[PDB]
Amino acid sequence: MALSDTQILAALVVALLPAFLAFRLSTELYK
Amino acid sequence: FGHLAVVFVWLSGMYFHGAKFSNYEGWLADPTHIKPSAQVVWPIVGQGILNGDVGGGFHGIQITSGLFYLWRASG
Amino acid sequence: ANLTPCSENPAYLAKSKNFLNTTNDPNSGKIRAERYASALCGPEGYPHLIVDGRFTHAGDFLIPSILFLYIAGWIGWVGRSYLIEIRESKNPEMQEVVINVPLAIKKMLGGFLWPLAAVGEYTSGKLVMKDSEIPTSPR
Amino acid sequence: TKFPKFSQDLAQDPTTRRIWYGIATAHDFETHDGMTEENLYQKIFASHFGHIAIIFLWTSGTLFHVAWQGNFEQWIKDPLNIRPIAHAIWDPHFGEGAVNAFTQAGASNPVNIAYSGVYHWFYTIGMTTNQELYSGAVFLLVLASLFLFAGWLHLQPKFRPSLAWFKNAESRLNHHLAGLFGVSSLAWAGHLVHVAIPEARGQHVGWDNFLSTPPHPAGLMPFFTGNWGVYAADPDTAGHIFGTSEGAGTAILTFLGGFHPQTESLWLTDIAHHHLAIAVIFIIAGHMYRTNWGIGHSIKEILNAHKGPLTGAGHTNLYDTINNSLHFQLGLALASLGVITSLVAQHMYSLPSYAFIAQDHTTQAALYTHHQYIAGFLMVGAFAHGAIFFVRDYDPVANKDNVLARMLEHKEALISHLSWVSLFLGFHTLGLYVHNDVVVAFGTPEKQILIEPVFAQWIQATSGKALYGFDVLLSNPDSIASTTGAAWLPGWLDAINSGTNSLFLTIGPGDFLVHHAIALGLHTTALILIKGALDARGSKLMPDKKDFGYSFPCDGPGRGGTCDISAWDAFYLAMFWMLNTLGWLTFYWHWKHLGVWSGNVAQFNENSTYLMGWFRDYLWANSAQLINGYNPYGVNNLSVWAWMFLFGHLVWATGFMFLISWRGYWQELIETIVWAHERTPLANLVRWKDKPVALSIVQARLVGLAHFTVGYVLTYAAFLIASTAGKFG
Amino acid sequence: MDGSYAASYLPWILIPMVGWLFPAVTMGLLFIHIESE
Amino acid sequence: MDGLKSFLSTAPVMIMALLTFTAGILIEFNRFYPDLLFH
Amino acid sequence: ALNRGDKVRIKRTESYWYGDVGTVASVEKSGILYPVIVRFDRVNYNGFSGSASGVNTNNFAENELELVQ
Amino acid sequence: SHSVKIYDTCIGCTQCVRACPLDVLEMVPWDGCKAAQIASSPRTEDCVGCKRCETACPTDFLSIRVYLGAETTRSMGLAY
Amino acid sequence: MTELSGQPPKFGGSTGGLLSKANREEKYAITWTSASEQVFEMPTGGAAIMNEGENLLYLARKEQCLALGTQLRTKFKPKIQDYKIYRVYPSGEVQYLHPADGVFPEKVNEGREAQGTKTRRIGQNPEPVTIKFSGKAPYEV
Ligand code: CLA
Numbered sequence A: 001m002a003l004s005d006t007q008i009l010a011a012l013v014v015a016l017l018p019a020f021l022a023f024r025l026s027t028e029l030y031k
Numbered sequence B: 001f002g003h004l005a006v007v008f009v010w011l012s013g014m015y016f017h018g019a020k021f022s023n024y025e026g027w028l029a030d031p032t033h034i035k036p037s038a039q040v041v042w043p044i045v046g047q048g049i050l051n052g053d054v055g056g057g058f059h060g061i062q063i064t065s066g067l068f069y070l071w072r073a074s075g
Numbered sequence C: 001a002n003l004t005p006c007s008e009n010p011a012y013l014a015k016s017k018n019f020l021n022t023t024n025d026p027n028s029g030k031i032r033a034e035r036y037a038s039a040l041c042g043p044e045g046y047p048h049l050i051v052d053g054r055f056t057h058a059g060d061f062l063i064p065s066i067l068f069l070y071i072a073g074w075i076g077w078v079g080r081s082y083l084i085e086i087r088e089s090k091n092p093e094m095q096e097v098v099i100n101v102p103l104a105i106k107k108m109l110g111g112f113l114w115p116l117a118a119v120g121e122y123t124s125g126k127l128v129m130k131d132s133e134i135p136t137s138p139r
Numbered sequence D: 001t002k003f004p005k006f007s008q009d010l011a012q013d014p015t016t017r018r019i020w021y022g023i024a025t026a027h028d029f030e031t032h033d034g035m036t037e038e039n040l041y042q043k044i045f046a047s048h049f050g051h052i053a054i055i056f057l058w059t060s061g062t063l064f065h066v067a068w069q070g071n072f073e074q075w076i077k078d079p080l081n082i083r084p085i086a087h088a089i090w091d092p093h094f095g096e097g098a099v100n101a102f103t104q105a106g107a108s109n110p111v112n113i114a115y116s117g118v119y120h121w122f123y124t125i126g127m128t129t130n131q132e133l134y135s136g137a138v139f140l141l142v143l144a145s146l147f148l149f150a151g152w153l154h155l156q157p158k159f160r161p162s163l164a165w166f167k168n169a170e171s172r173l174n175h176h177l178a179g180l181f182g183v184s185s186l187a188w189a190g191h192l193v194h195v196a197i198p199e200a201r202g203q204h205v206g207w208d209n210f211l212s213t214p215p216h217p218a219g220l221m222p223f224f225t226g227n228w229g230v231y232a233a234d235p236d237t238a239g240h241i242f243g244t245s246e247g248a249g250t251a252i253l254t255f256l257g258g259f260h261p262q263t264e265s266l267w268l269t270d271i272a273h274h275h276l277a278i279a280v281i282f283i284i285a286g287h288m289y290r291t292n293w294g295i296g297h298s299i300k301e302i303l304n305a306h307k308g309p310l311t312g313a314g315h316t317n318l319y320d321t322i323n324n325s326l327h328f329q330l331g332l333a334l335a336s337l338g339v340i341t342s343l344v345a346q347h348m349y350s351l352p353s354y355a356f357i358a359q360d361h362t363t364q365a366a367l368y369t370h371h372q373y374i375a376g377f378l379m380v381g382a383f384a385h386g387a388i389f390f391v392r393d394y395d396p397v398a399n400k401d402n403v404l405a406r407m408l409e410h411k412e413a414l415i416s417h418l419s420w421v422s423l424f425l426g427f428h429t430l431g432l433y434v435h436n437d438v439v440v441a442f443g444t445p446e447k448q449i450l451i452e453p454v455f456a457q458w459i460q461a462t463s464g465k466a467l468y469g470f471d472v473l474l475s476n477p478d479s480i481a482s483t484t485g486a487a488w489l490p491g492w493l494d495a496i497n498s499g500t501n502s503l504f505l506t507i508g509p510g511d512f513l514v515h516h517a518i519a520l521g522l523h524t525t526a527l528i529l530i531k532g533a534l535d536a537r538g539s540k541l542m543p544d545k546k547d548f549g550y551s552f553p554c555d556g557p558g559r560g561g562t563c564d565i566s567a568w569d570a571f572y573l574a575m576f577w578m579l580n581t582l583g584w585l586t587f588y589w590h591w592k593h594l595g596v597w598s599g600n601v602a603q604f605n606e607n608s609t610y611l612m613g614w615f616r617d618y619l620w621a622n623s624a625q626l627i628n629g630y631n632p633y634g635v636n637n638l639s640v641w642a643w644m645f646l647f648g649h650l651v652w653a654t655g656f657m658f659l660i661s662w663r664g665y666w667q668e669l670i671e672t673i674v675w676a677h678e679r680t681p682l683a684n685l686v687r688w689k690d691k692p693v694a695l696s697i698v699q700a701r702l703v704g705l706a707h708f709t710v711g712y713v714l715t716y717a718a719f720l721i722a723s724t725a726g727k728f729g
Numbered sequence E: 001m002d003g004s005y006a007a008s009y010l011p012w013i014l015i016p017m018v019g020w021l022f023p024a025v026t027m028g029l030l031f032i033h034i035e036s037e
Numbered sequence F: 001m002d003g004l005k006s007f008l009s010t011a012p013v014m015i016m017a018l019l020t021f022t023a024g025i026l027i028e029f030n031r032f033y034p035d036l037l038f039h
Numbered sequence G: 001a002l003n004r005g006d007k008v009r010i011k012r013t014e015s016y017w018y019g020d021v022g023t024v025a026s027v028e029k030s031g032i033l034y035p036v037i038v039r040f041d042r043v044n045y046n047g048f049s050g051s052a053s054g055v056n057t058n059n060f061a062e063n064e065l066e067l068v069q
Numbered sequence H: 001s002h003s004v005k006i007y008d009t010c011i012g013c014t015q016c017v018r019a020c021p022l023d024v025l026e027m028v029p030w031d032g033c034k035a036a037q038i039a040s041s042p043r044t045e046d047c048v049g050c051k052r053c054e055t056a057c058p059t060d061f062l063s064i065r066v067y068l069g070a071e072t073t074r075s076m077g078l079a080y
Numbered sequence I: 001m002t003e004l005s006g007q008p009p010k011f012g013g014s015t016g017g018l019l020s021k022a023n024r025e026e027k028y029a030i031t032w033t034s035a036s037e038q039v040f041e042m043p044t045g046g047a048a049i050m051n052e053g054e055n056l057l058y059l060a061r062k063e064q065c066l067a068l069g070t071q072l073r074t075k076f077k078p079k080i081q082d083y084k085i086y087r088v089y090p091s092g093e094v095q096y097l098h099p100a101d102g103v104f105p106e107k108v109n110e111g112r113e114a115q116g117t118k119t120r121r122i123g124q125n126p127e128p129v130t131i132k133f134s135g136k137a138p139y140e141v
């Protein structure tokens, strides 16, 4: 009934793109 | 000389409180059991409870300066 | 009120049998035990004070209240008018450092007319200064 | 030097203070070289979206850790005895005692018992399995990525919002009252009646189930026609079990009043009907201000019409003051947020609306104290931005004779009367506490001044408490306001007369003195903050404080010596007061609820009236189980709070160094350390690029303030959590 | 110390990464940035 | 003693004499009438 | 246009004595900016820290003084 | 560097010039006071911001102001 | 002006003297003409024997040089009031700093210019609202 390892890895992959998008926002907020 | 007068009136107060308002002869009668006390408190607002039973029926505040043992050492 | 009076409280009647003697009078705890019987107590046996303004409990609050409101006003008036009568003699600084003690004793005795003198000074305009001749701070 | 990019005056000094000053002026966008008016607003808007994505990542992380490492499926089986789990422990420094003591709440891995209210929240929302709230965590990751993309695209020159869009106050106040406060509360009432209430009725409603079944069997048509009583046809009775179908009559909007007798919480149908009845009024009040359509209000004519004889020029030329500046808006926003955050705190302990959160006492204590410590921060920041508004963005030639200028004209009356009120409360609250403490010390506790708080007991009497016998306006059953036939009469009366819950607690003679103490802390903190805001422009010492700025160290030793002359330094002293009065009210709250939860109400009612009772039965007695978190014999699960206790003491005393000692000593010491590094033989290879100096005066003030604050917060979050988790866990 | 949950292997590498590998390269990149010209 | 009257009328000696007189009448009123919480 | 020893209220709006009365000690010659020497009885915040007193005399202008005599 | 601005309230009492231990202030001629001189600060890159000139000045809210601006090696007073 | 003529005074050596800033960024040098061989306390630390005639002393900050100039002008009965404080760069150039006009700044002379002098009171300063985003200062403009 608990979670699986593939759900945790999918959560890491689906949170990888907020890291890229926050990197884009931080870069354009610096300049 | 003025500060020496302040120390002499302080030392006079210690020997006078050990003479009049203490239990030095009572403590000298039984040094092991009863406890020294050289300050009696006037009961005014309920502070007569500060005069605890220091031993031998004498009430007062138990001194911790320990100059009673100085007096027994001097004689 | 939900508080039981001290005339019939069981915890207060259990605690009043061993009230401690405060002064050198050996019956001081007993006369305190019958003095505090008129007050009202909670579930602990200690006399509470009704302060709502009802006159049946005015002895708890209002009777000392106006008593202090005399004495503070007395001190305030003795401290105020004395400053006025040392606004000039020759130099107010030394007369504030050392006290002109006959003038101070005169004000200290005469200060018991303070509330009528307060309404008199408020009506004469010599109590509250104007809002323009006061040394304010810059905005 | 490239860092800092925004400041040119800090990119040229060779000292080490330019790193600190580049860090602490990174968000003050007004003092940036080369920033116009509209670039300020656009950088604020993109940074707003960055923060609104960070808060979604934080909520997604709480959701993901309850899904992954939390016993949420084992908590819903018996939520009265088992403990919730925040996350797991993976530091490699754990020995064997710290693993055998941290495997709590039935888990083979070392875990950490959650003391926030996320489990009772997620159970009251209707989440049952870990999969749906893991899917909520993935959804919040996508939503945070959406707001990150919004922050990126609102920095491009094509999608750059103009300054007149930010100045459009009436065209966003409507959408914040209707399209943000109304339709989102409308959607929350919809989620309540569709998912939260049927999961409290036992019916599992998911995303593949809500399109088929209706929440009410009567359908949507009784709302369209009328006669809405069928939506409150049969409520859940007193014999209802949460999460199951047992005595649970289906009706979605039932106004009952009072508590659910099984979960000690508010009825979920009452919550849904309340949110519908607030969403309607918010959408109604959102149609007030004028937009492109000619119907509505414009705030200039409302403000200019509120003149007066005693008021002066009223609120004339005041729309431009709020709309041009930003620290005025931030001060009003922080003030309103601070009052409603303390409203959250005062209504999440007396009116709990979560399943079985009135029994988890440590969770309620941690949530109340957290929201009060947020509210004190926001109130201090509201007044701090008021002082920044008076320094930077206040012009007396446009705000002529209005309420702001007339506020400034009598500042010597305002802060002197606050000085009077502070001395009035302080002299006599301390006078009564020392009088009580002396007469208890002399063995005569009958001589205590125990003033009965008859005003608050009168408020309880007109609220429903028939305990005190004051038959006034709600406790008297034949009153005008009692016999109205409203829905909330019998349930709220039986809830307020039940001496089990924490709603309208029995106010004794100690609470009179402690509420005067909180009035003292509030009046003195308001004294320092209003004195900082109104003397932000100038005073008799230096009337050019508008020219020096907000934060500056002093004005030398001349003219008496003006240490702590800025309005920043009035924030500085008021921060200590906000921590002090928040410590006062949270000591008072936690001791009152420790007397309530244990059933020993007589201990707080007898001992709180003097100061040694606080020092003995609260600080000395309740901290016995905290410091025994690690003995020489063994280690229990309260060891991390004992270590956090000593940690908080260490940071709280480390702030004393920056507070007491000042800069010139440390500069003379750093001269000697510089000499020792420049004359040590083998360390002449390694030389600094930036010249090391001591911390600046206002800077190390802020550092000592930060250590005082986080030291205070860490040692109190250690003690407040571990004492009531040692007593009830 | 182990993990009863799913993917117990993952904090075994994520705790030293965020403890050492993330702050060392963050302080390295920041010290290179704030001391350059 | 044209200077002793001025020294006995300085601010510390006069405020100490006034506080001694105030504490004296307070202690005497509390001895002859002790333990008055109210009226 | 003031004499030597007349009471006058100050309207400097940035000084320590703002609304307090002062006696004109002397009026100097014309041409200079602030000729009106005004003396007060209340000293201001002046000098180093812990100094026993400050200054009272000051040069003021003509258009910022309200004569009360 | 800091900015030492000297206003027209200066009476030419030259206390601030002999008080400043860095030789930034100096008396220039003027025609607006009895002393017919006013202080002036040409060497403002040597001023550390000690505000010792704002302790010896007789005017109300002293006629010389030291606005603490940028910092450098001279304005921070470093011998290293 | 460009060349420093003088002899070093008699001194045993100290630790608060010239650090590594002297051969890297700048240092200072005071030159004065003594009368006798008296004793003076240098701001570096300790006492030193002032040599007879024109002597030269290297210091690290300008404040130490002006503190020595105050000690030379007040704490001697033959009041030495002919000292010159130069600034020496590691490139070799020497800048005449004080009393570079030629006469002391305490007294007035013709040839100076009023730098940094305002024509208003401090109460007549402008407000920071009208110049809220110009980048200037409320005291400058
Ligand atoms: C326990 C410590 C303590 C105490 C008692 C006070 C007390 C006070 N502070 Mg305070 N403060 C403190 C710590 C403390 N502060 C700290 C740590 C800070 C952070 C730096 C501040 C910052 C601060 C600010 C910024 C301000 C105050 C102000 C005040 C005063 C008004 C508030 C009040 O409650 O009315 C009165 C309460 C009292 C308790 C006064 C009674 C004091 C004694 C008991 C009087 C009895 C006389 C005494 C026995 C005579 C001594 C005799 C001896 C020589 C033998 C009050 C005197 C304000 C002020 O003074 O303006 C109104 C103000 O603006 N405080």
Ligand code: CLA
Binding pocket: C075, C076, C077, C078, C079, C080, C082, C104, C107, D416, D417, D419, D420, D423
């Ligand atoms: C007797 C002179 C006198 C008078 C009439 C007043 C009157 C007043 N003061 Mg006050 N004050 C005084 C002396 C006096 N003060 C002194 C000596 C001090 C220094 C300790 C203060 C410190 C003080 C503060 C800090 C504050 C006031 C405030 C106030 C106002 C509100 C009432 C109040 O709180 O007072 C209560 C008085 C006190 C708390 C202190 C006074 C206590 C002394 C013991 C009173 C007697 C002084 C003197 C020895 C008597 C002279 C007698 C003469 C024959 C020699 C009121 C107008 C408040 C204000 O601004 O209101 C808007 C306020 O915040 N006062």
Ligand code: CLA
Binding pocket: D088, D089, D090, D091, D092, D093, D098, D112, D639, D640, D643, E015, E018, E019, E023, E026, E027
């Ligand atoms: C020598 C002592 C020591 C050390 C080194 C640690 C170390 C750690 N403990 Mg720990 N612990 C200790 C003693 C110690 N403990 C003791 C005595 C107890 C009591 C028994 C505990 C109880 C305990 C518990 C109960 C838990 C830990 C956890 C952890 C880990 C934190 C996870 C992490 O890296 O987050 C990153 C660390 C932080 C975010 C904190 C740093 C905050 C910084 C300073 C503020 C921000 C600075 C700046 C703004 C941003 C950074 C700048 C930078 C990027 C350049 C970490 C490995 C946790 C764990 O296992 O992880 C899940 C955990 O749950 N510990």
Ligand code: CLA
Binding pocket: D045, D048, D049, D052, D121, D165, D166, D168, D171, D172, D175, D176, D178, D179, D180, D181, D184, D340
């Ligand atoms: C329907 C249209 C709509 C909507 C939904 C929004 C929504 C928003 N706008 Mg916006 N705006 C709009 C139209 C709209 N705008 C228009 C037409 C304009 C034209 C000029 C603007 C101009 C504008 C500006 C200039 C700014 C925003 C900003 C914002 C955001 C700030 C609100 C926030 O984060 O807290 C939302 C808070 C709540 C919904 C609740 C408030 C707190 C309540 C009252 C507390 C009590 C209940 C509480 C929820 C209980 C909690 C329980 C717990 C368990 C959760 C928000 C996302 C700001 C921004 O960028 O921030 C990101 C900003 O600076 N807007």
Ligand code: CLA
Binding pocket: D023, D024, D025, D026, D027, D028, D029, D330, D334, D377, D378, D379, D380, D381, D382, D384, D388, D550, D551, D568, D571, D706, D710
């Ligand atoms: C809605 C919230 C909000 C917002 C948007 C702002 C926004 C602003 N504030 Mg502000 N403020 C707020 C709330 C807010 N404030 C509150 C609640 C307070 C009271 C506490 C203040 C007090 C305050 C002061 C006193 C000042 C500002 C200033 C400013 C401006 C510049 C900020 C800056 O550069 O900081 C830069 C950021 C920092 C310096 C970071 C410091 C905070 C760190 C994180 C605290 C350290 C905690 C520690 C790491 C925890 C350790 C935990 C564990 C490891 C042990 C900016 C407009 C300044 C201004 O306008 O004048 C220049 C200013 O002087 N604010």
Ligand code: CLA
Binding pocket: A008, A011, A012, A015, D054, D057, D058, D059, D060, D061, D062, D064, D087, D088, D089, D090, E010, E011, E012, E014, E015, E018
């Ligand atoms: C902000 C919320 C938040 C917080 C406080 C934490 C905290 C923690 N997580 Mg975590 N996590 C989060 C969100 C969060 N997580 C999200 C959204 C995910 C999904 C990808 C994960 C996935 C995750 C895994 C898979 C693991 C942890 C673990 C841990 C623990 C050790 C630290 C670590 O290795 O993290 C490293 C985390 C990552 C590499 C991915 C998450 C990074 C998030 C998305 C960034 C958060 C942004 C943040 C607000 C920025 C702060 C800025 C501020 C300094 C100014 C620590 C308790 C470990 C653990 O349980 O050890 C016992 C572990 O194995 N987390």
Ligand code: CLA
Binding pocket: D092, D093, E015, E016, E018, E019, E020
């Ligand atoms: C927050 C994160 C964190 C983490 C995860 C740790 C973890 C650890 N600490 Mg530690 N510590 C921390 C913070 C942290 N600390 C802080 C903040 C402090 C200051 C208070 C300390 C102070 C401290 C002390 C004083 C000691 C430890 C020790 C230890 C270790 C105990 C077991 C041991 O001997 O390891 C053995 C050592 C290691 C595992 C070192 C790592 C070497 C790795 C295996 C080599 C990998 C390099 C590889 C070639 C590069 C790969 C490239 C990459 C991209 C893949 C353990 C690894 C103890 C110890 O002996 O550590 C040396 C010890 O005495 N710590």
Ligand SMILES: CC1=C(/C=C/C(C)=C/C=C/C(C)=C/C=C/C=C(C)/C=C/C=C(C)/C=C/C2=C(C)CCCC2(C)C)C(C)(C)CCC1
Binding pocket: D327, D328, D330, D331, D332, D335, D339, D379, D382, D383, D385, D386, D387, D389, D390, D530, D533
């Ligand atoms: C400085 C400054 C500032 C700040 C300020 C602030 C911060 C304030 C706050 C304030 C506040 C914080 C206030 C609040 C208050 C409120 C109130 C006061 C309310 C009341 C209400 C009422 C009264 C109601 C009634 C009732 C009751 C009570 C009960 C029953 C029910 C009813 C409803 C009937 C600003 C920003 C402006 C800017 C400028 C400057």
Ligand SMILES: CC1=C(/C=C/C(C)=C/C=C/C(C)=C\C=C\C=C(C)\C=C\C=C(C)\C=C\C2=C(C)CCCC2(C)C)C(C)(C)CCC1
Binding pocket: C051, C052, C053, C062, C072, C073, C075, C076, C077, C080, C118
């Ligand atoms: C009865 C009672 C009560 C009530 C009270 C009240 C409500 C109050 C109010 C109060 C108020 C509402 C007040 C007002 C005031 C105002 C003013 C305006 C004042 C005046 C003052 C002055 C002016 C001063 C003067 C003086 C004097 C008189 C003396 C001395 C000197 C002096 C100068 C200080 C209670 C409930 C508590 C309780 C019971 C009883």
Ligand SMILES: CC1=C(C/C=C(\C)CCC[C@H](C)CCC[C@H](C)CCCC(C)C)C(=O)c2ccccc2C1=O
Binding pocket: D657, D658, D659, D661, D662, D663, D664, D666, D667, D693, D694, D695, D696, D697, D700, D701
């Ligand atoms: C100790 C002390 C110093 C000396 C402070 C120094 C020398 C700073 C040294 C800081 C060391 C390097 C520790 C800094 C690291 C901290 C953990 C903070 C981390 C860095 C942040 C950027 C995150 C002062 O300069 C000072 C000035 C004014 C009043 C009081 C004091 C004061 O008390």
